[PDB]
Amino acid sequence: GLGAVFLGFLGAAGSTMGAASNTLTVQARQLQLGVWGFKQLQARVLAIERYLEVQQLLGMWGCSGKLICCTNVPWNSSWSNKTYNEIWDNMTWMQWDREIGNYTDTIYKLLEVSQFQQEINEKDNLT
Amino acid sequence: VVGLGAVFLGFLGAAGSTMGAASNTLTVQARQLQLGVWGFKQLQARVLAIERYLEVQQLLGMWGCSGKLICCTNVPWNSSWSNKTYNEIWDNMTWMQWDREIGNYTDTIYKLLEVSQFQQEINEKDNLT
Amino acid sequence: GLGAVFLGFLGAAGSTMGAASNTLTVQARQLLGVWGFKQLQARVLAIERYLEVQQLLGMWGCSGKLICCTNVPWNSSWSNKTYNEIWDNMTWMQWDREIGNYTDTIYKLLEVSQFQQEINEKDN
Amino acid sequence: VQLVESGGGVVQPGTSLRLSCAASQFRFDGYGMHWVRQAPGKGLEWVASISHDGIKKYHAEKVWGRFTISRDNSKNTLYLQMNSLRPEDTALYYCAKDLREDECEEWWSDYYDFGKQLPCAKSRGGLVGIADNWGQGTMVTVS
Amino acid sequence: QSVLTQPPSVSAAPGQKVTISCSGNTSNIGNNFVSWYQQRPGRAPQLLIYETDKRPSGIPDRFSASKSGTSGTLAITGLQTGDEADYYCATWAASLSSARVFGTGTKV
Amino acid sequence: LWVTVYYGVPVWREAKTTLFCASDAKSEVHNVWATHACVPTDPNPQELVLENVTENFNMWKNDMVDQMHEDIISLWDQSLKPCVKLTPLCVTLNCSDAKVEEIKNCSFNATTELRDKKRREYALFYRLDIVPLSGESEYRLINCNTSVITQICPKVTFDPIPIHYCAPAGYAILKCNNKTFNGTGPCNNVSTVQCTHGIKPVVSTQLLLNGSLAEEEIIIRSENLTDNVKTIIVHLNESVEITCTRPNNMTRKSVRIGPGQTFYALGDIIGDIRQPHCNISEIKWEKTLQRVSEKLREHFNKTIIFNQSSGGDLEITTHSFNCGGEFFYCNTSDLFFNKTTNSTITLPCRIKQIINMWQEVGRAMYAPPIAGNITCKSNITGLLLTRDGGTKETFRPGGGNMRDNWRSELYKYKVVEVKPLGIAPTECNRT
Amino acid sequence: LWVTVYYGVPVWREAKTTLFCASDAKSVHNVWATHACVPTDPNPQELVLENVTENFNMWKNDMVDQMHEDIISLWDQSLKPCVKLTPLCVTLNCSDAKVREEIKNCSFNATTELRDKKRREYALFYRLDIVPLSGSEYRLINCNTSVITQICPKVTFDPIPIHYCAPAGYAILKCNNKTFNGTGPCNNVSTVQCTHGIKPVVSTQLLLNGSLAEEEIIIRSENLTDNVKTIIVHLNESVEITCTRPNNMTRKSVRIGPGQTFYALGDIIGDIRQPHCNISEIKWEKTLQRVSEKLREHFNKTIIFNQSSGGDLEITTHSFNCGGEFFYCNTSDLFFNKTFNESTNSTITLPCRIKQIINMWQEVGRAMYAPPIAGNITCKSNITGLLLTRDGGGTKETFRPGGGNMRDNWRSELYKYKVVEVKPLGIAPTECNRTV
Amino acid sequence: LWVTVYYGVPVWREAKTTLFCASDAKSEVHNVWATHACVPTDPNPQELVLENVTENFNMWKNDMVDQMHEDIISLWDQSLKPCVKLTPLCVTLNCSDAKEEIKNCSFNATTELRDKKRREYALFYRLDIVPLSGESEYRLINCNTSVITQICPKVTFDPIPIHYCAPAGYAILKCNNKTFNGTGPCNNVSTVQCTHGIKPVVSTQLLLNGSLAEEEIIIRSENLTDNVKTIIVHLNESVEITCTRPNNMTRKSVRIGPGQTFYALGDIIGDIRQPHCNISEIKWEKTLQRVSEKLREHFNKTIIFNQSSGGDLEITTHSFNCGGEFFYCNTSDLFFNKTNSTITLPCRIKQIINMWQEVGRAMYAPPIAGNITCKSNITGLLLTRDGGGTKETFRPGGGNMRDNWRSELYKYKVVEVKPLGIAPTECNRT
Numbered sequence A: 001g002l003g004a005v006f007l008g009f010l011g012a013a014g015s016t017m018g019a020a021s022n023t024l025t026v027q028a029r030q031l032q033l034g035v036w037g038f039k040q041l042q043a044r045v046l047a048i049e050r051y052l053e054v055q056q057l058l059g060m061w062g063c064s065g066k067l068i069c070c071t072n073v074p075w076n077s078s079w080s081n082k083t084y085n086e087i088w089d090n091m092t093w094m095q096w097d098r099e100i101g102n103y104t105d106t107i108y109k110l111l112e113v114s115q116f117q118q119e120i121n122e123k124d125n126l127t
Numbered sequence B: 001v002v003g004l005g006a007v008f009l010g011f012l013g014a015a016g017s018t019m020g021a022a023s024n025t026l027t028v029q030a031r032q033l034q035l036g037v038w039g040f041k042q043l044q045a046r047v048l049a050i051e052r053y054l055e056v057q058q059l060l061g062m063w064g065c066s067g068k069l070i071c072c073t074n075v076p077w078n079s080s081w082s083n084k085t086y087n088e089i090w091d092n093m094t095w096m097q098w099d100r101e102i103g104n105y106t107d108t109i110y111k112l113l114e115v116s117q118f119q120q121e122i123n124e125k126d127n128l129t
Numbered sequence C: 001g002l003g004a005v006f007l008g009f010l011g012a013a014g015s016t017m018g019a020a021s022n023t024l025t026v027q028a029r030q031l032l033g034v035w036g037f038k039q040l041q042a043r044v045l046a047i048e049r050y051l052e053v054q055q056l057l058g059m060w061g062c063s064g065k066l067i068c069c070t071n072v073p074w075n076s077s078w079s080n081k082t083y084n085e086i087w088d089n090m091t092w093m094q095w096d097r098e099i100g101n102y103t104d105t106i107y108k109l110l111e112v113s114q115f116q117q118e119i120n121e122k123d124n
Numbered sequence D: 001v002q003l004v005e006s007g008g009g010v011v012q013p014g015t016s017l018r019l020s021c022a023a024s025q026f027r028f029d030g031y032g033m034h035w036v037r038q039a040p041g042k043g044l045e046w047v048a049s050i051s052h053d054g055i056k057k058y059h060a061e062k063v064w065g066r067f068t069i070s071r072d073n074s075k076n077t078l079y080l081q082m083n084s085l086r087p088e089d090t091a092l093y094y095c096a097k098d099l100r101e102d103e104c105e106e107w108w109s110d111y112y113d114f115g116k117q118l119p120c121a122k123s124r125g126g127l128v129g130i131a132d133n134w135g136q137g138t139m140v141t142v143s
Numbered sequence E: 001q002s003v004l005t006q007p008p009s010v011s012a013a014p015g016q017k018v019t020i021s022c023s024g025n026t027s028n029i030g031n032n033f034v035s036w037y038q039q040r041p042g043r044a045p046q047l048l049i050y051e052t053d054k055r056p057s058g059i060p061d062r063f064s065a066s067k068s069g070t071s072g073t074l075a076i077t078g079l080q081t082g083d084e085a086d087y088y089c090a091t092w093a094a095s096l097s098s099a100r101v102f103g104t105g106t107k108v
Numbered sequence F: 001l002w003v004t005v006y007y008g009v010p011v012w013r014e015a016k017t018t019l020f021c022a023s024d025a026k027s028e029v030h031n032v033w034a035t036h037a038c039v040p041t042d043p044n045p046q047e048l049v050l051e052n053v054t055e056n057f058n059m060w061k062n063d064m065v066d067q068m069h070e071d072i073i074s075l076w077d078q079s080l081k082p083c084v085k086l087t088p089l090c091v092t093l094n095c096s097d098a099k100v101e102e103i104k105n106c107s108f109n110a111t112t113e114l115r116d117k118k119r120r121e122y123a124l125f126y127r128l129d130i131v132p133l134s135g136e137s138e139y140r141l142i143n144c145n146t147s148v149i150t151q152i153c154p155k156v157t158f159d160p161i162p163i164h165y166c167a168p169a170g171y172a173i174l175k176c177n178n179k180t181f182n183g184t185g186p187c188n189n190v191s192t193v194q195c196t197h198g199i200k201p202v203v204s205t206q207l208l209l210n211g212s213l214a215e216e217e218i219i220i221r222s223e224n225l226t227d228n229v230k231t232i233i234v235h236l237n238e239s240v241e242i243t244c245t246r247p248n249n250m251t252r253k254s255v256r257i258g259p260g261q262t263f264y265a266l267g268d269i270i271g272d273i274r275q276p277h278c279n280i281s282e283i284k285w286e287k288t289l290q291r292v293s294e295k296l297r298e299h300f301n302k303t304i305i306f307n308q309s310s311g312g313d314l315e316i317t318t319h320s321f322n323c324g325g326e327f328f329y330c331n332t333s334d335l336f337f338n339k340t341t342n343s344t345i346t347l348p349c350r351i352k353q354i355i356n357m358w359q360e361v362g363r364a365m366y367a368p369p370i371a372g373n374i375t376c377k378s379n380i381t382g383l384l385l386t387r388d389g390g391t392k393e394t395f396r397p398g399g400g401n402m403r404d405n406w407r408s409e410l411y412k413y414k415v416v417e418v419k420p421l422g423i424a425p426t427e428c429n430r431t
Numbered sequence G: 001l002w003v004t005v006y007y008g009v010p011v012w013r014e015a016k017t018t019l020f021c022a023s024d025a026k027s028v029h030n031v032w033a034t035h036a037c038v039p040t041d042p043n044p045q046e047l048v049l050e051n052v053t054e055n056f057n058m059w060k061n062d063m064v065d066q067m068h069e070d071i072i073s074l075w076d077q078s079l080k081p082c083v084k085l086t087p088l089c090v091t092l093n094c095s096d097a098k099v100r101e102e103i104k105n106c107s108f109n110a111t112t113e114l115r116d117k118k119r120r121e122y123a124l125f126y127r128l129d130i131v132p133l134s135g136s137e138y139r140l141i142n143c144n145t146s147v148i149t150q151i152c153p154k155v156t157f158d159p160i161p162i163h164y165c166a167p168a169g170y171a172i173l174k175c176n177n178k179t180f181n182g183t184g185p186c187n188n189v190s191t192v193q194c195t196h197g198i199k200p201v202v203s204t205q206l207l208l209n210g211s212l213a214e215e216e217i218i219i220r221s222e223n224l225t226d227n228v229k230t231i232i233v234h235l236n237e238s239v240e241i242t243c244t245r246p247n248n249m250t251r252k253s254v255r256i257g258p259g260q261t262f263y264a265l266g267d268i269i270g271d272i273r274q275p276h277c278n279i280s281e282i283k284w285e286k287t288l289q290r291v292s293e294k295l296r297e298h299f300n301k302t303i304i305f306n307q308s309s310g311g312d313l314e315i316t317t318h319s320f321n322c323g324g325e326f327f328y329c330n331t332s333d334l335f336f337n338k339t340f341n342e343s344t345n346s347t348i349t350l351p352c353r354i355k356q357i358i359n360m361w362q363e364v365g366r367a368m369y370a371p372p373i374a375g376n377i378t379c380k381s382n383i384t385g386l387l388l389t390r391d392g393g394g395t396k397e398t399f400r401p402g403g404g405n406m407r408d409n410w411r412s413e414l415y416k417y418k419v420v421e422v423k424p425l426g427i428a429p430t431e432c433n434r435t436v
Numbered sequence H: 001l002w003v004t005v006y007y008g009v010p011v012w013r014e015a016k017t018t019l020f021c022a023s024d025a026k027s028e029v030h031n032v033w034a035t036h037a038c039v040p041t042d043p044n045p046q047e048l049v050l051e052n053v054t055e056n057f058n059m060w061k062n063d064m065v066d067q068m069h070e071d072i073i074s075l076w077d078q079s080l081k082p083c084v085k086l087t088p089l090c091v092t093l094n095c096s097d098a099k100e101e102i103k104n105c106s107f108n109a110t111t112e113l114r115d116k117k118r119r120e121y122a123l124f125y126r127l128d129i130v131p132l133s134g135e136s137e138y139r140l141i142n143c144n145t146s147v148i149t150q151i152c153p154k155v156t157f158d159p160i161p162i163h164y165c166a167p168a169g170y171a172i173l174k175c176n177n178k179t180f181n182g183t184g185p186c187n188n189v190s191t192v193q194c195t196h197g198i199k200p201v202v203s204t205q206l207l208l209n210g211s212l213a214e215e216e217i218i219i220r221s222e223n224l225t226d227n228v229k230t231i232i233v234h235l236n237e238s239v240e241i242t243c244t245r246p247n248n249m250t251r252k253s254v255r256i257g258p259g260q261t262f263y264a265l266g267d268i269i270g271d272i273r274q275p276h277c278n279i280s281e282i283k284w285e286k287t288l289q290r291v292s293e294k295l296r297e298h299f300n301k302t303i304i305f306n307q308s309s310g311g312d313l314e315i316t317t318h319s320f321n322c323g324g325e326f327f328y329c330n331t332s333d334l335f336f337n338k339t340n341s342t343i344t345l346p347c348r349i350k351q352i353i354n355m356w357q358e359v360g361r362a363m364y365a366p367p368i369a370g371n372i373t374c375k376s377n378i379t380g381l382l383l384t385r386d387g388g389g390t391k392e393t394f395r396p397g398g399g400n401m402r403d404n405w406r407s408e409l410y411k412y413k414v415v416e417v418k419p420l421g422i423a424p425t426e427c428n429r430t
């Protein structure tokens, strides 16, 4: 079910970033042409368009089936000048995306070139 | 519908062969206006094709197998689901009869692979502090 | 979203095959009515054209790589040319007309090689 | 069928007279009428001609301005005013009836009703100069 | 003020043939049909020929007539004693009043 | 020191979408709401509890009610397109009095199955439904000079059955749980679901019918509490009963007009004619306008007096609701809205057959007469008020708009979309 | 020992979905929207599931409930922009036609090109199409119960084969057992992408063009010992049939209002002859002698055929279509009037009657009007299958022809098909974990 | 030595697809070319140049011109379905002469009821009514061969630019060769995400608002040695044109039935005058000679310009729209007769239009209060040869309606990109 999986991510939206990586474990352990016949069709196509969009965006930089995958881009000091002890222990995820919300298009473009360049150097090890 | 329409019917053959031989006989098997009533049924069909394809792909992506065919999962086989041995199943059964016996435990078996992979993800990726 | 990525591949239509892998680098680093049903028929058609390529890339392995590699010997009957001649004096569109009739036999042969490699590995 | 004429009798030179022709045994408003005359020892001669409704009147060249003809749908008779009586006018004056009937083709109607019988709009059929019924006629005499 | 040239009286013996002619002009018969009538002595006239080619149901096939250009001819077969009467020619046109002229009479 | 991406982070931002129907399977009836072609619901809906979060959402700036208004309007137009019209009925009438008056006995010409023959038939029409050309007497229908009129099929019903609004896969409908949360305000006990609760689509002007009592501490929802246009939407916590009927026993005559068309008109009235009347309880209602007068005073610091309705037409001034398939029109003017044991208030109501609903010049409906004895027993949960101006403040009921009948039940909902892609620096690079 | 998943396993499960059209790329604007249908493939590839027994019902199928609901919604899509004959039925002063006597000469009043005036036209209608008022003056048959619309002559009702094909992810099973009756397990089931050609023909007593059985006659039924369920008899070695009308007809456009006109019957060249069908009696008698042999096998008693029940005409006739004019043939007392026990091809002639205003699918609310086809029509068709019902005697089982529904025709072409969905995800234990 | 795959290679193939609308951000009037449902455009579009490319284009075998003509046809049927039809209007119009092209028609119509009738009066042009018995009694032009409908008086027909944009996964090529006619291989092909603004207009003789050539007058055709092909002439220096209506009409709402009503012309304020269009004389004889020197280079024979043949007022008349009032201008023998002033153009207005010359279509355009003025702009021409053998004659033809857009979509071609490429190399799985 595509609908029941996107709702589980929203659970514990008030917890810190350091405890959200382990809270989802304990919450999943216990677990024809009418006006109404067209909006259902227009919603299923919109559901597919939203699932693969966040999935195809992943497949551009290395990560396709992973969740906590790491990237080889050096973290700047202009996007966020806070220490590691304060970001992952005293701030929720929704509040964190309000700080780097302006450095979004400059990051997604930097993640792509940092992975496409890896394939060129990797496949040139045979020549 | 033109590319993924003949792939699901592809492995549907050899449905009478045993389980231990289904992975072998299939190898040699491939050794050979626009607004009317028909326009709305074809558009209704193309959505059902995509909805039924990635739904299988979305279940695999959450089990640690991105697109692999036969991926071993780190989950111990419970003895209560099947009392029979291992050599008897692959040579005295078939894939259609297997669903009629173990397919009733499909609820707890689809979440057990999730926890055994989600916890394993943070045990390796998130362990590198 | 899915349209701006497909248009970027066409930026080297005249460049040689050997330089197309590096020509895209200098470009990326440089930077209810009638229409309610017509647009709906386009969003369904856009998804159908995307995953159709993402499906053929799943049957041959390497479902996430760009420059992949398969274990299939290059038959000397489909193309009677050399290796150094292709990647220096040939463009990608011109190369297709000389081979684009052997695609249906090379897509099926590539599918058997990855399917055979899966059985030979999981047996061990 | 029967056609009877009226208005005849003895007249004096220079006086006036109005002839009548009562019609019966047929649809009066559905046929044209003609007026003829034949001198004793001579042949016939047309006098006037009228349509079924009287909107078209035609006479002879010698009696322009003096002789008129008209009909009436409520009394069913034909009038013929004869002025300036001349000795060469004594003839056998008869009343003729045409054969072609004005068969209607388009009646006025009323959508949302379609039952009310409204008058006719576009009829066809005029005069043909054929007399199928001849009356007894009234003899005139001037001296 | 046109006139139809017709013979005033012709001989009619029982058993012979009698022809009745009707000569006019171009304005009266050259563009319009011609008719025929019979007026017996002491009796009222009656229609005999209409539309130059049709006959009423009251007359036999002995009465016949035809036209040729600007003149018409009446040809009747089987002459008897009771056929001696006055026959007329008649033209009528609603265009001009010079075409409505009766024949001078043909006594047979 | 290295950028890493996370899949499944709780990050959401509000947006717009298209919600679909949802209702449990019951049974063919061919209801006016196409629930027979609607996806069934789920017995146990998912309702998480988001803790340590204070989401603020507006009530009047919502967009879920603008999609619901564009849904019910498109629903009635679907059930009225294959209907038979009353165009051959716009003929001059000739009416008289009724039996042993607001019931007129009219007679007119009507074309039979073929246009060539016409017969004189008779029917019964309400006085509120015909207008006189000149009082002598000849009358005419009320909608034969503005637009065309259609008659709804006798097989379809107007029964309001609950429907659920579910967001598509990839979205989330938030839901607050605060006790005294009015229209706009940051709610702290936020909870998420994927489908709304039971929503019964009803229509009314002065009162609310078959609503949902939310919680104690009767809420006074508005936008500009210091204005003269914004309609105050009270939300009760102890609903009182309202019962009314039609004590007549009327038949259903099936007359024929035009070739291939026919409509059902009123026939005979069995028994003596009696007036419809609603029986809102007396002592249970007096204390309702006393708890409100003590709750509305705190927001104004003044003593309040209640007047009757404004006056004029009927759809916008007084009560107007549906009951078992027959549209009622009461007054409720100066029987319990003229104030500041166990008796009962009796409200003289009036019934009409042709309704210019939804506030347009066209698309006038014609409810066929229901044979028998119609009876309803509903609840009133919340009123609709409107200031005057100006001491003392004078309040009076008024249906300033029609969408407010649904904002009383879609006030604690908010639709948002999730973006599960996160970015955070860490000490892990590509090995 | 360890759990592992498998992709692409032969696992199916019965379900229901929405199919779509598929026809040849031979493209007129037929009544069936084939010009907007997706073309098929020149080589339908199918598999042969070996060594498997699958059981599927025939009467509880869903493709027959979808095909019947498709044709209903397809005719309304082709009759919506059509002109309606609302101002047609007035007091018709019908008289006898000027040269057994089933056609009348009617003269009525209709509005001319402009609404203010009216005229008086004349047309020719059949006796089966008009009813009298004073039981002189007649009026149209069914304009008192519903509105009537005609069909534009720009469309045709040629039955062309269509393929009902399932979306990606589904497989339409297909049987190959020769003696497979209605229900039961097929021991030689073979999957296929979608079905073969299906001609959408409409008949009531004798099945028209269709697929023939391979080995022998099949007697399909839901409950043979019942009394209401129709008995579909499938045939082998079909019998030919030629239905003709040697009379001519000239169409004529008359005005019935501003911007509206419909075609009626004008003159008739030559004398009147009865439109009739022809059946080779030697082949037919050889057929009924065999169908009367297998029904005895299931009943153990003698059987007799009898005339149709009676009543109305839309049920007790051979109401089929040919050329564009709906026939109504008296297929009784010449075929079903005898029993069975133990040369010059005397062709049987069936006196048929033609009707224009037909309300198909017994749905009051839509009555179509067919324009007259100029000339003469002739169609040499096939008779592959019959429809028989019982009476309830006891003895001797009296059989009468006549269907019970309109969906019964398509239950003879869809008797070896079934839609299922595949579940390619499998689970089986092995001696392999994710540490290699 | 071994086979490998490559994702994202510049490989395209010709194919057909569906293209949706893409309008600007300017929207409530609810035009026939709806914008409340059309997706907004992109401020910074995506365009790029393909170095060393050569793609052969074609104009007369294109698909976009067959979809655009099929798109706007369904657009009018969508906006005319809920409108009122003028069926009860076909009555015996007793039209006298108004105070000579406009008649004072006094007819009978139904009141609010259906058992009573009253005598109304309205004004109609001579082109909309035909006589039954002249001198009288008149009748409408198409009350016998087609049903007539009325445009909703709340919509307008402003030509607004729309963008046809292919779905995600396609591309719309664009040639930049400035001396490139319809056919022929382009040499400066540039790929754009979708087309620029395309003003949908309707014209027969000349071509209104559009784009230019910027280098030289281009002469496009499918077969120049033919006789029935419409030779499209593209210009580079546009000329000015203005069309007015000095009359001052008034709108009157009359009744035709219960719930139905339509608007007709009432009295006319001010003196009656005739509509006319203006074209600069010096700016026309200069823009016509440049075509006389280009069209001669393809025939090597002297050429002369004639007028149209005649007949119906849809092919021999510069039919165009202006502010909601359809204009028919006789441009036959004022500048096309034989080959600081101002050339006048006497026109005539018709309000019952048979759109696209199809049986069953008849639109009644409601009148417009006040005068109108359309400062239009000519960009292209339409010609038609004759059966000659010496000199040559060219006449303004009206061959088709879809031919009006081929002067705008001459440099576009939709293709389907295929990103999977197969190429031999030297690699294997470790």
Ligand SMILES: *[C@@H]1O[C@H](CO)[C@@H](O[C@@H]2O[C@H](CO)[C@@H](O)[C@H](O)[C@H]2NC(C)=O)[C@H](O)[C@H]1NC(C)=O
Pocket (backbone or CB within 6 Å): F180, F181, F182, F183, F184, F185, F186, F222, F223, F224, F225
């Ligand atoms: C009850 O409603 C009133 C007004 O209708 C709210 O008072 C203000 O509401 C606005 C937002 O609508 C806030 O920004 C202000 O801070 C509120 N207080 C003022 C202006 O003094 C009130 O907040 C609502 N009650 C609750 C619990 O939210």
Ligand SMILES: *[C@@H]1O[C@H](CO)[C@@H](O)[C@H](O)[C@H]1NC(C)=O
Pocket (backbone or CB within 6 Å): B014, B016, B017, B018, B021, B025, G050, G051
């Ligand atoms: C049935 O056919 C399958 C496929 O060929 C085969 O594997 C199996 O052994 C067969 N069973 C028998 C009894 O041979």
Ligand SMILES: *[C@@H]1O[C@H](CO)[C@@H](O)[C@H](O)[C@H]1NC(C)=O
Pocket (backbone or CB within 6 Å): B100, B101, B104, B105
């Ligand atoms: C499978 O599980 C169901 C309960 O989910 C149980 O009823 C059944 O007996 C089990 N075994 C089967 C179906 O063989």
Ligand SMILES: *[C@@H]1O[C@H](CO)[C@@H](O)[C@H](O)[C@H]1NC(C)=O
Pocket (backbone or CB within 6 Å): C097, C098, C101, C102
């Ligand atoms: C490609 O192969 C096909 C075989 O069907 C042949 O018809 C075609 O000519 C070939 N093309 C080239 C360029 O060799």
Ligand SMILES: *[C@@H]1O[C@H](CO)[C@@H](O)[C@H](O)[C@H]1NC(C)=O
Pocket (backbone or CB within 6 Å): F372, F373, F374, F375
């Ligand atoms: C209406 O009144 C009659 C008379 O007593 C009663 O029988 C009937 O039940 C009433 N209707 C309802 C719905 O109770």
Ligand SMILES: *[C@@H]1O[C@H](CO)[C@@H](O)[C@H](O)[C@H]1NC(C)=O
Pocket (backbone or CB within 6 Å): H179, H180, H181, H182, H183, H184, H221, H222, H223, H224
């Ligand atoms: C222009 O048109 C001519 C004839 O119409 C044609 O031969 C030529 O190829 C076209 N293109 C160019 C660039 O001349």
Ligand SMILES: *[C@@H]1O[C@H](CO)[C@@H](O)[C@H](O)[C@H]1NC(C)=O
Pocket (backbone or CB within 6 Å): H209, H210, H238, H240, H376, H377, H378
């Ligand atoms: C045509 O010229 C006029 C005059 O300047 C100008 O306003 C108009 O924009 C031009 N047409 C177009 C399409 O730009």
